[PDB]
RNA sequence: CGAUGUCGGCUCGUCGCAUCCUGGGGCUGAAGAAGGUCCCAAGGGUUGGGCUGUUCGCCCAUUAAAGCGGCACGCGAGCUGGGUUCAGAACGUCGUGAGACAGUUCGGUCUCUAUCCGCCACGGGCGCAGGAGGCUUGAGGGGGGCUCUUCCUAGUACGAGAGGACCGGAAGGGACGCACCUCUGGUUUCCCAGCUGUCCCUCCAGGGGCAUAAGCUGGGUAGCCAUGUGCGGAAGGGAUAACCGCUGAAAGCAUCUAAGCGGGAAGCCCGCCCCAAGAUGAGGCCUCCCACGGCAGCCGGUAAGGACCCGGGAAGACCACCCGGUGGAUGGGCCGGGGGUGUAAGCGCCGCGAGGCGUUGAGCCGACCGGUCCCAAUCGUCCGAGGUCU
RNA sequence: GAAUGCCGGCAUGAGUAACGAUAAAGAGGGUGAGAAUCCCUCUCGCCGUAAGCCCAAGGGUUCCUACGCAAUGGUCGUCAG
RNA sequence: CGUGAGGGAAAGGUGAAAAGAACCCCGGGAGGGGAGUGAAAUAGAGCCUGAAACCGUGGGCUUACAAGCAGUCACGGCCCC
């Protein structure tokens, strides 16, 4: 049973999963769009979205909170000076995940794309 | 044998005569009468009820024409109360008064594929003293060459729950008609938001 | 355990009968509304990069 | 429907607002309606609320006391009609929401670990002045 | 929630200090005794020269438990130990004083003389 | 004997009845209560411990009762391995010896993958003469079936006294079963905080990794849960067993019987709960669609409908099932509430300092109850009747 | 036609068990007919009385570079002992 | 294979002649389709002949209420000549 349990496990133990989400947050906040498997892509949405919202509040507290996950001050400066301002009136939905057509050759993994939104 | 269709909203406990009474709250009213089962037409007596209005776009053609035949709005659920012929075209919580005893049918919570210890309260195996990978296993399932087979109805692993269960002789604790609300003392099958059926009890 | 083993060779018929559920179902494919190419529904068109009426990918 | 609202509506008729707020570490006196024979009386139970288990109308609090050499704990529904009233005896201050650890402490150590919450003691005396 | 093997304190002045439950006298096979239930115990420790002494096979009613008991008012109570009081075959206390509080459930189940002797009933 | 694994235990049942208990009887050297003995009855039940490998048995504490037997002394491709049952060792005994002993003693490798039948669960197919969406009848199955205490009757009938009922009527238990999470109590792998060592970001402050597959510690939502909660055994109707009668010959009497008619069990049939029309004997009701073209057959195009795909789901191994797909609140986000945690950072003030006080129940914050089209369920595709004959 | 015969071929079990330490991965960029698997960058994890370095046995070209991928590599391969 | 003494295999055939398939087409290659050689190309080198087991594609008959050492006797249907 799994009744009303939220969150994927992705066959990673607790800290490998947290690292997975964090690293994916760096790559997304860096390049603006990345390609992953559909399931990882669906889970990245809420993890990055939260960090962006904190970038909107913009206070010092938020920046240290965000730095717990992203660690990279340069990147956080980008999230605060560049990324977050283009979302001032957009309440939620800072990312989107669109499934891609062709599976990955070696293991059949269904892929999608995750990006920040205009 | 009156009866009503319902939703299981949730549990709490009320205080009645310096006594915490665990209850389950049921949103039962109101149920439009949709079709009547008569002995001349169908061979038995029952009342087909309806519950929860439906987005009329979502009601396909054969269902639609079934509602119009007995002028009624589109409803999400049809169910029958066997041997019940109420005089109006609508069934509401008013057919129960507090102090009455009821039976409640719902779909139990589904355990999926369930082991023999969870499904049948088997005792499993020892957890030490050399017990070898049989800690939750069934044990023997038979005899030897006589009968050389396993009984029908053997209790084994399989799907457990998400099945129709009726709990019998539950006390109606209060009836709040302004909210189509029925309080019943004790536990009722299924998850919150579950379809349930509340009938007058079969226990004298 | 005591190494359970097949008692008889399976017959050509029984083995092929077991395989009566092994056929593939073909890919479900719709036309991309812009380049008309067949593609899986609910995927970004891999031929022209259009999805929901706009260019999303270089291709 | 709003199942949460429906339940909050069932509960509403029994909700209670006469009782004074408290925290884990406060010493409290619960005046409790008790039956025995052939009567019913009010038995005062006094001790440290060691736990406030929150669930709305259903929250409960657990008070711990010594009664003639023996530890006694009492769990109360915060909206029970059997509670006549609650008297804040003393404002403790914890660093912790559950104070189970005081079950294993001498009376000396409990006193050292649950000191007077001067802030909320003053807060009480301040707004203890009515027209 | 007392079962065989369970050690209980002795809340009276009989001489016993510890008894080990060997039976829940409640039907043919009850698993547990609580407040108001009667047990058969063996005296595992006694102060010198009391009515009861080590080795004795005595009867006792559970007067407080460490498992919390639930009351119809929807509240519950719980004590720091498991204690009992030695009785004769009429439920009457074989000692002449009882120490510490006792559950009010003793009253309903007819252990009136222990309840009065109790310094507190909770 | 080109192997049918051997005791006991655990687990899991199932059956017999020569019945241990509960139910119904007759006889009693049956006053009552309690027994004895035989008959009927297998629905249910038949406890926990000390000893011993033990079966058995004895004992302790209870019990309504602690029944006896079958199923390869039921069950080692289910577990155990104490015993027995190899190779070591020793004792007693026997043998000059080597060695020997259902004599004792200590130790001593029990094999991941289930083909077929069988069993538990779940689908796929085709059928059920048109094709569909629903709702249903219940043939036939399964499940359940226990029992104790106290009180009232009444300290009455009965008995010199001790004691002590029937019938009928209340209440409260034990074990068992189904369901549940309001309370009680667990878990809660990252929801919060505290702490050590170390390395790092960035020097401070503040943080991050690692110390487990949570580093450790204190707490803990939803869920899943029992120790927690509700409910179940019935009631009732029918037919019976032993047993008791009514009326009544054969056989002027007599006789429960030969004609006929009563009474009568926890047992039997129904009644309760669950499954069920593959019930091919394929049932029934309500509604929807239709006489489409080309040549009981065939080729397509549509209908009613369905499936595909996708967002999901206290549903779930896959499958199935259930909801939703912009006509939208389905998941994600965000907002409010709940809930946990227990007063963040930063700044100010006190202190030499560790810290402390204030801002501040702060800040963080999974799942729970909702709101909100910000993000994603885009766009679509394929199936699918024209109704055999008397 | 049988010798649990001999040699060889080919079935069944079966798309089943398994793919060899639970130290762990993610993305971007390049190469290419083809890339989870090769190269490069950034991030994350693991060893650190070694899972790092040197020497002796033993092995005998496995070393370096270019060019390749049929087989070998438990998948893949543009990479490689 | 075994430390060693020692053990100890499998594996023959295009065609008369290489005339061993220029060139083109798909393909990264393998492979194939044409063209071409040959009396012959399922003689194309994985090459004479090419049985059987085993695997597949096409067609006829037949099969989803049925109990089987799978055949046999009878009758009927359908297909074929
Ligand atoms: Mg499940
Ligand atoms: Mg699990
Ligand atoms: Mg969800
Ligand atoms: Mg998580
Ligand atoms: Mg999940
Ligand atoms: Mg998931
Ligand atoms: Mg995991
Ligand atoms: Mg995996
Ligand atoms: Mg992994
Ligand atoms: Mg983990
Ligand atoms: Mg870790
Ligand atoms: Mg890790
Ligand atoms: Mg998509
Ligand atoms: Mg796809
Ligand atoms: Mg690949
Ligand atoms: Mg239902
Ligand atoms: Mg199990
Ligand atoms: Mg269980
Ligand atoms: Mg169960
Ligand atoms: Mg067990
Ligand atoms: Mg166990
Ligand atoms: Mg054991
Ligand atoms: Mg072992
Ligand atoms: Mg073993
Ligand atoms: Mg083993
Ligand atoms: Mg184990
Ligand atoms: Mg087993
Ligand atoms: Mg056997
Ligand atoms: Mg047989
Ligand atoms: Mg199911
Ligand atoms: Mg009420
Ligand atoms: Mg629920
Ligand atoms: Mg085994
Ligand atoms: Mg075995
Ligand atoms: Mg096996
Ligand atoms: Mg094993
Ligand atoms: Mg095996
Ligand atoms: Mg075999
Ligand atoms: Mg064949
Ligand atoms: Mg074959
Ligand atoms: Mg075949
Ligand atoms: Mg098969
Ligand atoms: Mg292109
Ligand atoms: Mg709620
Ligand atoms: Mg409301
Ligand atoms: Mg008092
Ligand atoms: Mg105190
Ligand atoms: Mg009051
Ligand atoms: Mg004491
Ligand atoms: Mg033999
Ligand atoms: Mg053999
Ligand atoms: Mg053999
Ligand atoms: Mg053999
Ligand atoms: Mg054999
Ligand atoms: Mg038996
Ligand atoms: Mg008999
Ligand atoms: Mg009897
Ligand atoms: Mg009797
Ligand atoms: Mg008598
Ligand atoms: Mg007598
Ligand atoms: Mg008798
Ligand atoms: Mg008799
Ligand atoms: Mg029986
Ligand atoms: Mg039976
Ligand atoms: Mg029996
Ligand atoms: Mg015993
Ligand atoms: Mg002992
Ligand atoms: Mg022992
Ligand atoms: Mg024993
Ligand atoms: Mg024994
Ligand atoms: Mg035996
Ligand atoms: Mg013996
Ligand atoms: Mg007794
Ligand atoms: Mg008896
Ligand atoms: Mg036997
Ligand atoms: Mg045998
Ligand atoms: Mg024998
Ligand atoms: Mg024997
Ligand atoms: Mg045996
Ligand atoms: Mg036996
Ligand atoms: Mg056996
Ligand atoms: Mg074995
Ligand atoms: Mg055995
Ligand atoms: Mg066996
Ligand atoms: Mg075997
Ligand atoms: Mg077996
Ligand atoms: Mg066997
Ligand atoms: Mg054993
Ligand atoms: Mg042994
Ligand atoms: Mg031994
Ligand atoms: Mg022995
Ligand atoms: Mg031995
Ligand atoms: Mg031996
Ligand atoms: Mg040997
Ligand atoms: Mg030996
Ligand atoms: Mg030996
Ligand atoms: Mg000797
Ligand atoms: Mg001898
Ligand atoms: Mg001898
Ligand atoms: Mg001699
Ligand atoms: Mg001698
Ligand atoms: Mg011999
Ligand atoms: Mg011997
Ligand atoms: Mg022997
Ligand atoms: Mg013998
Ligand atoms: Mg011998
Ligand atoms: Mg040893
Ligand atoms: Mg031995
Ligand atoms: Mg083997
Ligand atoms: Mg296998
Ligand atoms: Mg099988
Ligand atoms: Mg077979
Ligand atoms: Mg089917
Ligand atoms: Mg199907
Ligand atoms: Mg047909
Ligand atoms: Mg049948
Ligand atoms: Mg029936
Ligand atoms: Mg039946
Ligand atoms: Mg009386
Ligand atoms: Mg009675
Ligand atoms: Mg009862
Ligand atoms: Mg809850
Ligand atoms: Mg709880
Ligand atoms: Mg609770
Ligand atoms: Mg709790
Ligand atoms: Mg965290
Ligand atoms: Mg650190
Ligand atoms: Mg530093
Ligand atoms: Mg620092
Ligand atoms: Mg590190
Ligand atoms: Mg680690
Ligand atoms: Mg940590
Ligand atoms: Mg610690
Ligand atoms: Mg914890
Ligand atoms: Mg806890
Ligand atoms: Mg929780
Ligand atoms: Mg329980
Ligand atoms: Mg009960
Ligand atoms: Mg007569
Ligand atoms: Mg007659
Ligand atoms: Mg009669
Ligand atoms: Mg009769
Ligand atoms: Mg009579
Ligand atoms: Mg009768
Ligand atoms: Mg009964
Ligand atoms: Mg049904
Ligand atoms: Mg049908
Ligand atoms: Mg049906
Ligand atoms: Mg039939
Ligand atoms: Mg039908
Ligand atoms: Mg019908
Ligand atoms: Mg359509
Ligand atoms: Mg799913
Ligand atoms: Mg539906
Ligand atoms: Mg749909
Ligand atoms: Mg659509
Ligand atoms: Mg649309
Ligand atoms: Mg939504
Ligand atoms: Mg939402
Ligand atoms: Mg929220
Ligand atoms: Mg809140
Ligand atoms: Mg709060
Ligand atoms: Mg502060
Ligand atoms: Mg602060
Ligand atoms: Mg200063
Ligand atoms: Mg200050
Ligand atoms: Mg919140
Ligand atoms: Mg959130
Ligand atoms: Mg809206
Ligand atoms: Mg939108
Ligand atoms: Mg389209
Ligand atoms: Mg021969
Ligand atoms: Mg052979
Ligand atoms: Mg062989
Ligand atoms: Mg053989
Ligand atoms: Mg051979
Ligand atoms: Mg041969
Ligand atoms: Mg051979
Ligand atoms: Mg061979
Ligand atoms: Mg094979
Ligand atoms: Mg498979
Ligand atoms: Mg298999
Ligand atoms: Mg498998
Ligand atoms: Mg596998
Ligand atoms: Mg591996
Ligand atoms: Mg492994
Ligand atoms: Mg490990
Ligand atoms: Mg790349
Ligand atoms: Mg690339
Ligand atoms: Mg690759
Ligand atoms: Mg590749
Ligand atoms: Mg590289
Ligand atoms: Mg490390
Ligand atoms: Mg070091
Ligand atoms: Mg060398
Ligand atoms: Mg070498
Ligand atoms: Mg070489
Ligand atoms: Mg070199
Ligand atoms: Mg080289
Ligand atoms: Mg190299
Ligand atoms: Mg190279
Ligand atoms: Mg290669
Ligand atoms: Mg390759
Ligand atoms: Mg290759
Ligand atoms: Mg080559
Ligand atoms: Mg290879
Ligand atoms: Mg390879
Ligand atoms: Mg390998
Ligand atoms: Mg290359
Ligand atoms: Mg290599
Ligand atoms: Mg050798
Ligand atoms: Mg060699
Ligand atoms: Mg040799
Ligand atoms: Mg040879
Ligand atoms: Mg040769
Ligand atoms: Mg030649
Ligand atoms: Mg030649
Ligand atoms: Mg020639
Ligand atoms: Mg090419
Ligand atoms: Mg080309
Ligand atoms: Mg070529
Ligand atoms: Mg070709
Ligand atoms: Mg060619
Ligand atoms: Mg030619
Ligand atoms: Mg010629
Ligand atoms: Mg010729
Ligand atoms: Mg030829
Ligand atoms: Mg030829
Ligand atoms: Mg020739
Ligand atoms: Mg040839
Ligand atoms: Mg050939
Ligand atoms: Mg064929
Ligand atoms: Mg039939
Ligand atoms: Mg047929
Ligand atoms: Mg025949
Ligand atoms: Mg014939
Ligand atoms: Zn396109």
Swiss-Prot record, chain A:
Which spans are transmembrane here?
none
Single GO MF descriptor = structural constituent of ribosome
At the top level, the lineage of the source is: Bacteria
Keywords tagged on the record: Ribonucleoprotein, Ribosomal protein
This protein's GO CC annotations: cytosolic large ribosomal subunit
Instruction: Fetch the InterPro entries from UniProt.
Output: Ribosomal_bL17 (IPR000456), Ribosomal_bL17_sf (IPR036373)
> Do you know which Pfam families this protein is assigned to?
Ribosomal_L17
The biological processes this protein is annotated with in GO are: translation
Does this entry carry the keyword Ribonucleoprotein?
yes
**Family listed:** Belongs to the bacterial ribosomal protein bL17 family.
Assembly description: Part of the 50S ribosomal subunit. Contacts protein L32.
The entry's protein name is Large ribosomal subunit protein bL17
Which organism is this entry from? Thermus thermophilus (strain ATCC 27634 / DSM 579 / HB8)
The lineage, from the top, is: Bacteria, Thermotogati, Deinococcota, Deinococci, Thermales
UniProtKB/Swiss-Prot annotation, chain B:
Q: Which organism is it from?
A: Thermus thermophilus (strain ATCC 27634 / DSM 579 / HB8)
What is the protein name for this chain?
Answer: Large ribosomal subunit protein uL3
Q: Which HAMAP family match?
A: Ribosomal_uL3_B (MF_01325_B)
Q: Which family does it belong to?
A: Belongs to the universal ribosomal protein uL3 family.
Task: List this protein's GO terms for biological process.
Answer: translation
Tell me the PROSITE patterns matching this sequence. Answer: RIBOSOMAL_L3
- Gene3D superfamilies attached here? 3.30.160.810, Translation factors
- What domain of life is recorded for the organism? Bacteria
What post-translational changes are documented for it?
A: The mass differences between the observed and calculated masses are suggested to be due to methylation, which is known to occur in the E.coli and R.palustris orthologs.
GO MF annotations, alphabetized: rRNA binding; structural constituent of ribosome
A cellular component annotation (GO) from this entry: cytosolic large ribosomal subunit
Q: Which UniProt keywords apply?
A: Methylation, Ribonucleoprotein, Ribosomal protein, RNA-binding, rRNA-binding
Q: List the PANTHER family hit by this protein, alphabetically.
A: 50S RIBOSOMAL PROTEIN L3, LARGE RIBOSOMAL SUBUNIT PROTEIN UL3C
From Swiss-Prot, chain D:
Q: Name a GO molecular-function annotation.
A: structural constituent of ribosome
| UniProt keyword terms in alphabetical order | Ribonucleoprotein, Ribosomal protein, RNA-binding, rRNA-binding
Q: Which GO terms describe its biological process?
A: translation
Matches recorded under PROSITE patterns:
RIBOSOMAL_L19
Q: Cellular component terms, GO, for this chain's entry?
A: cytosolic large ribosomal subunit
Is Transport one of the keywords? no
Q: Does the keyword Lipid metabolism apply?
A: no
Q: Where are the transmembrane segments?
A: none
Q: What Pfam families is this protein classified in?
A: Ribosomal_L19
Q: Which family does it belong to?
A: Belongs to the bacterial ribosomal protein bL19 family.
Assembly and partners are described as: Part of the 50S risobomal subunit. Contacts protein L14. Forms a bridge to the 30S subunit in the 70S ribosome, contacting the 16S rRNA.
This chain's function reads: Contacts the 16S rRNA of the 30S subunit (part of bridge B6), connecting the 2 subunits.
Q: Write the protein's name.
A: Large ribosomal subunit protein bL19
Name the species this protein comes from: Thermus thermophilus (strain ATCC 27634 / DSM 579 / HB8)
UniProtKB/Swiss-Prot annotation, chain E:
Entry's Gene Ontology molecular function annotations: large ribosomal subunit rRNA binding; structural constituent of ribosome
Q: Which Pfam families match?
A: Ribosomal_L14 (PF00238)
Tell me, which GO biological process terms does this entry list? translation
One GO cellular component term of this record is: cytosolic large ribosomal subunit
- Is Ribosomal protein given among the entry's keywords? yes
Disulfide topology = none
> What Gene3D superfamilies does the entry give?
Ribosomal protein L14
Q: Which UniProt keywords apply?
A: Ribonucleoprotein, Ribosomal protein, RNA-binding, rRNA-binding
Q: How does it assemble?
A: Part of the 50S ribosomal subunit. Contacts protein L19. Forms a bridge to the 30S subunit in the 70S ribosome, contacting the 16S rRNA.
Which purpose does this protein serve, as stated in its record?
This protein binds directly to 23S ribosomal RNA. Contacts the 16S rRNA of the 30S subunit in two different positions helping to form bridges B5 and B8.
Q: Which family does it belong to?
A: Belongs to the universal ribosomal protein uL14 family.
Name recorded for this polypeptide: Large ribosomal subunit protein uL14
Q: Which organism is it from?
A: Thermus thermophilus (strain ATCC 27634 / DSM 579 / HB8)
> Which taxonomic lineage is given here?
Bacteria, Thermotogati, Deinococcota, Deinococci, Thermales
């Amino acid at each position: 049973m799994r009744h009303l349990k939220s969150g994927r496990k992705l066959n990673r133990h607790s800290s490998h999963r947290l690292a997975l989400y964090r690293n994916q947050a760096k790559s997304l906040l860096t390049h603006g769009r990345i390609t992953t498997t559909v399931p990882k892509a669906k889970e990245l949405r809420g993890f990055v979205d939260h960090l962006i919202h904190l970038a909107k509040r913009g206070d010092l507290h938020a920046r240290r909170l965000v730095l717990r996950d992203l660690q990279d001050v340069k990147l956080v400066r980008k999230l605060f000076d560049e990324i977050a301002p283009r979302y001032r009136d957009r309440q939620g939905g800072y990312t989107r995940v669109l499934k891609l057509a062709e599976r990955r050759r070696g293991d059949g993994a269904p892929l999608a794309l995750v990006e920040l939104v205009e | 044998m009156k009866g009503i269709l319902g939703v299981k909203v949730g549990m709490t406990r009320i205080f009645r005569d310096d006594r915490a009474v665990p209850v389950t709250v049921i949103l039962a009213g109101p149920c439009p009468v949709v079709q009547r089962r008569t002995p001349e037409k169908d061979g038995y007596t029952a009342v087909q009820l309806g519950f929860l209005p439906q987005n009329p776009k979502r009601v396909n053609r054969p269902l639609k024409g079934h509602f119009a035949k007995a002028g009624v709005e589109p409803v999400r659920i049809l169910r029958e109360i066997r041997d019940f012929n109420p005089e109006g075209d609508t069934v509401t919580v008013e057919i129960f008064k507090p102090g009455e005893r009821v039976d409640v049918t719902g779909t139990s919570k589904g355990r999926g594929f369930a082991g023999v210890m969870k499904r049948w309260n088997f005792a499993g195996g020892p957890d030490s003293h050399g017990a070898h990978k049989i800690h939750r296993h069934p044990g023997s399932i038979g005899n030897r060459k006589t009968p050389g087979r396993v009984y029908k109805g053997k209790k084994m692993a399989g799907h457990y729950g998400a099945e129709r269960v009726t709990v019998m002789n539950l006390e109606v604790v209060d009836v709040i008609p302004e909210e189509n609300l029925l309080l019943v003392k004790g536990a009722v099958p299924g998850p919150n938001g579950g379809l349930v059926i509340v009938r007058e009890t079969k226990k004298a | 355990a005591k190494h359970p083993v097949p008692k008889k060779k399976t017959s050509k018929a029984r083995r092929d009968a077991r395989r009566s559920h092994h056929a593939l179902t073909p890919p479900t494919l719709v036309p991309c509304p812009e380049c008309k190419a067949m593609k899986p529904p609910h995927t970004v068109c891999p031929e022209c990069g259009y999805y929901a009426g706009r260019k999303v990918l270089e291709v | 429907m709003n199942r949460g609202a429906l339940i909050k509506l069932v509960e509403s008729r029994y909700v209670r607002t006469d009782l004074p707020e408290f925290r884990p570490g406060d010493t409290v006196r619960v005046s409790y309606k008790v039956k025995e024979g052939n009567r019913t009386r009010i038995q005062d139970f006094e001790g440290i609320v060691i736990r406030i288990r929150r669930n709305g109308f259903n929250t409960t609090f657990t008070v711990r006391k010594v009664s003639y050499g023996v530890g006694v704990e009492r769990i109360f529904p915060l909206h029970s009609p059997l509670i006549q009233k609650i008297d804040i005896v003393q404002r403790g201050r914890a660093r912790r929401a559950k104070l189970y650890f005081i079950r294993n402490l001498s009376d000396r150590e409990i006193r050292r670990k649950l000191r007077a919450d001067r802030k909320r003691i003053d807060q009480d005396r301040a707004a203890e002045r009515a027209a | 929630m007392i079962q065989p093997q369970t050690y209980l304190e002795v809340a009276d002045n009989t001489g016993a200090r510890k008894i080990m439950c060997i039976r829940v006298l409640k039907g043919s096979n009850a698993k547990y005794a609580t407040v108001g239930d009667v047990i058969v115990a063996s005296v595992k420790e006694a102060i010198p020269r009391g009515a009861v002494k080590e080795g004795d096979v005595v009867k006792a009613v559970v007067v407080r438990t460490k498992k919390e008991i639930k009351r119809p008012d929807g509240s519950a109570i719980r004590f720091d130990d498991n204690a009992a009081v030695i009785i004769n075959n009429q439920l009457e206390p074989r000692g002449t004083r009882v120490f510490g509080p006792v559950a009010r459930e003793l009253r309903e189940k007819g252990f009136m003389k222990i309840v009065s002797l109790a310094p507190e009933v909770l």
